[PDB]
C-alpha cells in the first residue's frame, strides 16, 4: 500500500539555522551525522541535536494550513502533502498563534473568525460515571 508522507517544519535558533543551512546546501552525508531528531513519548517534546549540541523542542500546531506543491515545469503544481505542525527549537502551549509568513502574525487572535456555542470527552466521562452509578440528582443552579 501507499502511506501519505508526513511533512512538518523545523524552526531552529538563528546561528544553528545558519549552520544547518550551510550543511544542507553543501550536500554531503556529513550533515546526516551532525543533525539528529529525538521525539519524546509525550509527542509534543523533543531534542534536535545540531553538531551534537542538544536543543529543546516543542511540536506545535499551526493556525493556518500549508500545502507543499511540487512542480516540474513551474507552471502546473501538484499538491504533495499538508503541513500543520512545527518543531520549534531553542494543550494551549502546543498551539502556535502566529503564521509562518510575515503578513500572518497574530492570525489566530485577529484574522480568524471565532464561532462558539476535550469538552465532548469530559461529557462522555460524566455520562460513563452516571451509568456506573445508581441514583443521579440534577438541578440547574444559581449563585452558591
Amino acid at each position: 500500500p501507499h502511506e501519505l508522507e508526513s511533512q512538518f517544519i523545523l524552526r531552529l535558533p538563528p546561528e544553528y539555522a545558519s549552520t544547518v543551512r550551510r550543511a544542507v546546501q553543501s550536500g554531503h552525508v556529513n550533515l546526516k551525522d551532525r543533525l539528529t531528531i529525538e521525539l519524546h513519548p509525550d509527542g509534543r517534546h523533543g531534542i534536535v541535536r545540531v553538531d551534537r549540541v542538544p536543543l529543546a523542542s516543542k511540536l506545535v500546531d499551526l493556525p493556518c494550513v500549508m500545502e507543499s506543491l511540487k512542480t516540474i515545469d513551474k507552471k502546473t503544481f501538484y499538491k504533495t502533502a499538508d503541513i500543520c505542525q512545527m518543531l520549534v527549537s531553542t494543550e494551549k502551549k502546543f498551539i502556535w498563534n502566529h503564521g509562518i509568513t510575515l503578513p500572518l502574525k497574530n492570525v489566530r487572535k485577529r484574522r480568524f473568525r471565532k464561532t462558539a456555542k476535550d469538552v465532548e470527552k469530559e461529557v462522555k466521562r460524566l455520562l460513563s460515571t452516571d451509568a456506573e452509578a445508581v441514583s443521579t440528582r440534577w438541578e440547574i443552579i444559581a449563585e452558591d
Partner: protein, 43 residues
C-alpha cells in the same frame, strides 16, 4: 446557571457514598443536558 450532579455508588465490601459534582463550564453543560433531554425522549 451552572450545573450540579449528585452520583450514588457502592464501594468495595459494603458502602453507599454519594458524590455531588458541580460543572461551571457552560460548554460541558450544553452537551451534557442535550443527551439527557434526548435520552428522556429516547424512551
Amino acid at each position: 446557571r451552572c450545573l450540579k450532579i449528585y452520583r450514588t455508588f457502592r464501594d468495595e465490601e459494603g458502602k453507599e457514598y454519594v458524590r455531588c459534582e458541580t460543572v461551571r463550564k457552560p460548554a460541558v453543560i450544553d452537551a451534557y443536558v442535550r443527551i439527557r433531554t434526548t435520552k428522556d425522549e429516547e424512551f
